[PDB]
Amino acid sequence: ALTKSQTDRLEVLLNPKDEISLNSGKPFRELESELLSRRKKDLQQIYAEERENYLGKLEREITRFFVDRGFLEIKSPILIPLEYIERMGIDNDTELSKQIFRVDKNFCLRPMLAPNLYNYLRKLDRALPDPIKIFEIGPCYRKESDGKEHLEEFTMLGFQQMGSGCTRENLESIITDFLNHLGIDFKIVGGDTLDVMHGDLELSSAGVGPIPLDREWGIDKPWIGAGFGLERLLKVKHDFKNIKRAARSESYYNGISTNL
Amino acid sequence: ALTKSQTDRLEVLLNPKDEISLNSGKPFRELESELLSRRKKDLQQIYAEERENYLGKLEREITRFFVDRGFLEIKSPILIPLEYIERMGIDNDTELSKQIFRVDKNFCLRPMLAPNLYNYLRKLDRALPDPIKIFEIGPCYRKESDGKEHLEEFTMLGFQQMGSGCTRENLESIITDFLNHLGIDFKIVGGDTLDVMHGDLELSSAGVGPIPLDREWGIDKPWIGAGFGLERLLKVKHDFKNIKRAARSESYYNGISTNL
Numbered sequence: 256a257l258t259k260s261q262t263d264r265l266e267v268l269l270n271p272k273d274e275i276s277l278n279s280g281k282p283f284r285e286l287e288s289e290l291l292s293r294r295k296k297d298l299q300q301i302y303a304e305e306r307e308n309y310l311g312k313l314e315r316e317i318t319r320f321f322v323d324r325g326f327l328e329i330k331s332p333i334l335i336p337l338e339y340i341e342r343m344g345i346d347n348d349t350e351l352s353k354q355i356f357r358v359d360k361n362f363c364l365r366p367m368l369a370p371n372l373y374n375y376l377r378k379l380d381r382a383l384p385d386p387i388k389i390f391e392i393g394p395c396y397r398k399e400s401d402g403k404e405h406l407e408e409f410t411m412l413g414f415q416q417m418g419s420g421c422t423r424e425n426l427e428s429i430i431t432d433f434l435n436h437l438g439i440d441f442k443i444v445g446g447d448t449l450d451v452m453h454g455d456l457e458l459s460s461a462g463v464g465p466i467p468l469d470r471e472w473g474i475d476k477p478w479i480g481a482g483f484g485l486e487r488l489l490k491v492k493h494d495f496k497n498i499k500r501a502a503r504s505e506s507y508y509n510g511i512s513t514n515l
Numbered sequence: 516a517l518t519k520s521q522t523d524r525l526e527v528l529l530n531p532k533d534e535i536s537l538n539s540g541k542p543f544r545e546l547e548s549e550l551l552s553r554r555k556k557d558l559q560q561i562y563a564e565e566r567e568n569y570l571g572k573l574e575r576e577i578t579r580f581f582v583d584r585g586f587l588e589i590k591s592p593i594l595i596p597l598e599y600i601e602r603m604g605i606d607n608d609t610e611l612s613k614q615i616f617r618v619d620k621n622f623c624l625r626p627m628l629a630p631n632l633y634n635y636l637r638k639l640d641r642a643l644p645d646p647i648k649i650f651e652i653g654p655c656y657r658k659e660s661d662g663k664e665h666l667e668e669f670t671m672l673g674f675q676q677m678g679s680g681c682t683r684e685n686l687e688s689i690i691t692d693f694l695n696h697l698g699i700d701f702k703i704v705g706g707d708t709l710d711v712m713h714g715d716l717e718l719s720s721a722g723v724g725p726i727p728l729d730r731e732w733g734i735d736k737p738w739i740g741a742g743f744g745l746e747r748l749l750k751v752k753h754d755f756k757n758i759k760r761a762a763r764s765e766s767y768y769n770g771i772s773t774n775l
């Protein structure tokens with residue numbers, strides 16, 4: 256009989272592709288030594304042969320996809336004015352107001368990319384030809400209850416197109432090409448809203464404008480856009496049972512435990 | 516006579532390669548219209564032809580340099596335990612303690628990469644062959660007085676090697692190959708410390724261990740490493756007069772004003 260604590264320890268060391276039954280007769284000590292050897296070899300193979308981090312590599316692959324498709328790569332501030340949250344319509348009744356990491360008196364860690372993308376669309380509308388296509392990838396922050404699908408520090412991809420061609424059909428085509436390119440199974444389920452699901456897991460929320468909120472941001476053109484969590488994409492792709500395996504972490508490297 | 520406010524406005528629109536004398540007889544209104552046209556064309560050319568952000572592209576170029584050189588790419592948390600700052604020896608007498616962005620009661624936005632790199636070196640020492648070579652690129656945060664060389668939100672490259680080959684000569688060779696690869700002029704000036712200078716601007720501080728601090732982090736092997744600011748590298752490379760031109764920003768895109 257393995258104790259529940261010895262099983263938690265072995266499950267840290269287990270990778271989805273492992274073919275080992277934790278319930279078989281071998282003693283903890285031996286099963287731990289086997290898995291430690293495997294995970295050490297896994298890290299050695301990464302270090303010898305490719306050396307790229309899953310989250311960095313995914314960001315670079317997504318970047319090439321969107322640049323190639325005519326979207327401008329944005330890198331905007333992560334620490335943003337608290338006033339942006341209110342101007343997004345996030346009042347006390349909405350659940351997100353309680354999820355904000357505040358910094359100082361007038362700043363917060365951004366929980367979303369939409370504010371900065373709105374500001375860029377408005378400013379670039381002055382210099383760039385129709386349609387304006389932009390995207391950003393980077394850290395976002397939300398206070399969350401413990402969950403196998405939520406991190407407090409995560410990474411989001413946001414893209415938005417404004418002007419002509421901003422139809423639901425074009426939006427679904429971008430999403431569909433994107434996820435088939437990455438090899439991620441999905442279903443699209445549906446101010447017009449749209450969620451991109453993998454089973455019960457939300458990969459993305461997507462939107463079609465105009466919506467009344469646009470006016471506060473100086474936007475008055477149709478638009479389409481979506482936001483995706485990179486760690487959720489990694490979790491699906493690598494079949495991780497807990498999203499912590501995909502996070503920025505000192506505890507996991509490319510889903511391999513670092514506590515060996 | 517241009518007013519000092521009209522000159523500030525024109526200097527936002529001026530790019531280093533511009534050949535225009537702000538002091539010549541043409542009226543503000545005309546000089547503004549010329550520069551607006553130029554900056555709009557500049558943005559249009561980026562959008563038509565490459566579409567990559569300076570900071571993202573630099574991060575990807577640095578990543579390839581270090582991966583190719585045998586360094587493992589790390590992506591570790593940006594929001595870190597406040598206890599890491601104290602354990603770095605950052606007490607009240609040191610100036611950095613006053614520079615920390617605190618979050619909640621027990622967390623902060625990291626002002627440096629050294630804590631997470633120490634933790635990774637210690638853990639990986641258990642699985643990887645000697646020498647252990649790692650690097651990370653990502654956001655760091657410090658409270659700063661207004662300066663043409665300091666941002667409160669910046670991006671740092673940190674690399675560290677532990678075990679054999681950890682000589683000052685090897686460290687200077689990495690730095691030298693790196694900056695000659697990027698095309699950035701520098702001088703190295705020098706527990707052994709080393710600063711990499713561009714004129715009066717510090718591009719990097721570098722170090723050779725062991726040092727007594729290592730013991731608190733579970734490290735007991737020689738090491739070499741360095742930290743570089745990406746926005747400072749961009750500032751030098753593109754001859755920006757103020758580092759805000761290179762930052763994560765809503766006010767500049769690849770050093771071009773977005774307020775057109």
Ligand SMILES: Nc1ncnc2c1ncn2[C@@H]1O[C@H](COP(=O)(O)OP(=O)(O)NP(=O)(O)O)[C@@H](O)[C@H]1O
Binds near residue numbers: 407
């Ligand atoms: N805490 C989180 N951890 C990881 N990914 C997240 C988190 N919050 C949001 N995301 C991702 O970001 C995308 C866009 O954000 P958003 O639509 O606001 O999320 P959401 O509606 O709060 N999803 P959920 O909390 O799972 O019901 C989501 O579809 C996820 O893929």
Ligand SMILES: Nc1ncnc2c1ncn2[C@@H]1O[C@H](COP(=O)(O)OP(=O)(O)NP(=O)(O)O)[C@@H](O)[C@H]1O
Binds near residue numbers: 720
């Ligand atoms: N506020 C900042 N804005 C931009 N880059 C920075 C900032 N602080 C540090 N860096 C960069 O990060 C590198 C390593 O950090 P560190 O050696 O701690 O900086 P530092 O000693 O405080 N430099 P300085 O404040 O200019 O005297 C520096 O050499 C810079 O290239």
Ligand SMILES: N[C@H](Cc1csc2ccccc12)C(=O)O
Binds near residue numbers: 368415460480
């Ligand atoms: N639910 C949204 C996801 C998103 C990011 S950019 C963007 C542009 C259009 C639609 C959605 C988004 C959010 O919370 O940001």
Ligand SMILES: N[C@H](Cc1csc2ccccc12)C(=O)O
Binds near residue numbers: 627629673674740741
């Ligand atoms: N002054 C240092 C720069 C740095 C980052 S990683 C690293 C590893 C070795 C030496 C320096 C560094 C700091 O403040 O972090």
Ligand SMILES: [Mg+2]
């Ligand atoms: Mg949520």
Ligand SMILES: [Mg+2]
Binds near residue numbers: 457459460
């Ligand atoms: Mg949603």
Ligand SMILES: [Mg+2]
């Ligand atoms: Mg300083």
Ligand SMILES: [Mg+2]
Binds near residue numbers: 719
């Ligand atoms: Mg220094």
